[PDB]
Design a protein around this ligand. Structure first.
Ligand SMILES: C[C@@H]1N[C@@H](c2cn(-c3ccccc3)nn2)[C@H](O)[C@@H]1O
Length: 445
């Protein structure tokens, strides 16, 4: 055991109501919106294949010239109520918004820098508008915040001199100032999701990460803080030198997911995954023909996969420079929403079920020990294998949409064939199970 002043604080999962809400929400949307939406992956006639929100980096653009894009920031089709409606319709319970990305342009009128929405033709506090509009729809709002800031010359990638250290110390104060500002300007915020924290400068300043966490928790009761923020005394990130999770939830599954057989450890803590629709574009990119674009079922698969393992999933959108969403994104949100409106009882407020993974799809567990079978791969055998943990029996199966009864046949001790429905639902579908735990078993149930 190593002693630490800046390692983990939470013993296991938080169980206060605010965390239970963060968790029960399950499905979120991510919004990456910034100056990068203007060029949309293209600089001086060259279309770059890299992530559009990193175009400043791919095209080697200097800060002064990149930030002049502010002069073209005028999203005339922006309407926060419309965005909130789109999210509501998709079935998202929360939205995570880029308050400031690496480029350092702020979507709120920060008093600590000139690189904000206030100094654009549009002028308006976009972030405040969104907060209000989402909240009015009953949607929680989470703030993405990039510590790394390409707009501020006090930023350092590493601390290699006393000068570096003096500059970076000012930078951290500047950062603290922006964070306090967001927390006090927008007190309905439920979560801060830190990015751009991997540089050696931040690793060397573990103490600050812990302080940022504590500071925000004092300012916003019940607020959640992601693991990606945190470095310990030794510079170890996410999990401290004693293997303990820092922050309130684990936030490293980005465009990938834990293996449903080999990575069951994740069920021990809260966590959130995020994903993109194309392969690797977060900000708006004008040409989606350059990589694989996920279909709605492929996205729904990932959402359910996450919930089946006790995690959240956040699906990313990269709005156009005009403040509308491209057609592929409107289609996606609508398709997701349609499915969730039908089958969302197996997603919202659900969790890991403790059953062995089977090939047909995923289990999720409801608040009242409902066990949902979410079927993505339909067996030609017409039988869905269900192997129960020790002491658990299956008493009934019911097709969720119709209430029709589904035959359950015992094949061995602890295993059943659950029949597929008589009519093929023709889309991923849910069978709700009623299970019973014997007197004197172990496990939840
Ligand atoms: C949530 C996603 N995180 C950002 C990211 C992080 N990185 C990155 C780049 C180099 C090293 C480590 C991480 N690249 N892009 C993406 O631009 C987006 O905000």
């Amino acid at each position: 055991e190593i002693p630490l002043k800046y390692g983990a604080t939470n013993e296991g999962k938080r169980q206060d109501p605010a965390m239970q809400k963060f968790r029960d929400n399950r499905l979120g949307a991510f919004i990456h919106w910034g100056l990068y939406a203007i060029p949309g992956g293209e600089w001086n006639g060259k279309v770059y294949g890299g992530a559009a929100e990193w175009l400043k980096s791919w095209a080697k653009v200097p800060a002064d010239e990149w930030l002049k894009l502010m002069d073209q920031w005028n999203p005339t089709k922006f309407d926060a109520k419309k965005w909130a409606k789109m999210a509501k319709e998709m079935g998202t319970k929360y939205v995570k918004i880029t308050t400031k990305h690496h480029e350092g342009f702020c979507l709120w009128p920060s008093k600590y820098t000139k690189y904000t929405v206030a100094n654009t033709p549009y002028k308006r506090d976009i972030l405040g508008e969104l907060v209000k509009a989402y909240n009015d729809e009953g949607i929680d709002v989470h703030f993405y915040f990039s510590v790394m800031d390409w707009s501020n010359p006090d930023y350092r990638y590493d601390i290699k001199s006393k000068e570096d250290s003096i500059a970076f110390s000012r930078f951290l104060e500047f950062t603290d100032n922006q964070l306090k500002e967001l927390a006090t300007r927008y007190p309905t915020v439920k979560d801060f999701w830190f990015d751009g924290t991997w540089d050696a400068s931040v690793k060397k300043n573990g103490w600050w990460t812990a302080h940022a966490e504590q500071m925000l928790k004092e300012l916003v009761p019940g607020v959640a803080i992601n693991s990606r923020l945190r470095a310990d005394d030794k510079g170890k990130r996410h999990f401290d030198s004693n293997g303990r999770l820092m922050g309130d939830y684990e936030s490293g599954y980005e465009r990938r997911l834990p293996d449903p057989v080999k990575d069951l450890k994740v069920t021990q803590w809260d966590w959130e995954a995020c994903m993109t629709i194309p392969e690797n574009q977060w900000g708006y990119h004008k040409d989606w023909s350059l990589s694989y674009v996920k279909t709605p079922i492929e996205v729904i698969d990932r959402i359910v996969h996450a919930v089946s393992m006790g995690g959240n999933m956040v699906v990313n959108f990269g709005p156009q420079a005009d403040g509308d969403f491209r057609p592929e994104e409107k289609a996606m949100a609508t398709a997701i929403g349609k499915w969730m409106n039908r089958y969302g009882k197996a997603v919202y407020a659900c969790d890991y079920a403790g059953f062995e993974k089977q090939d047909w799809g995923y289990y999720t567990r409801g608040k009242n020990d409902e066990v949902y079978m979410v079927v993505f791969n339909q067996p030609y055998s017409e039988r869905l294998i269900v192997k129960t943990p020790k002491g658990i029996t299956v008493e009934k199966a019911t097709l969720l949409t119709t209430g029709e009864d589904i035959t359950v046949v015992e094949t061995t001790r602890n295993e059943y064939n659950v029949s597929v429905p008589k009519k093929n639902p023709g889309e991923p579908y849910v069978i709700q199970l009623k299970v019973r735990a014997a007197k004197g078993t172990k496990s939840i149930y």
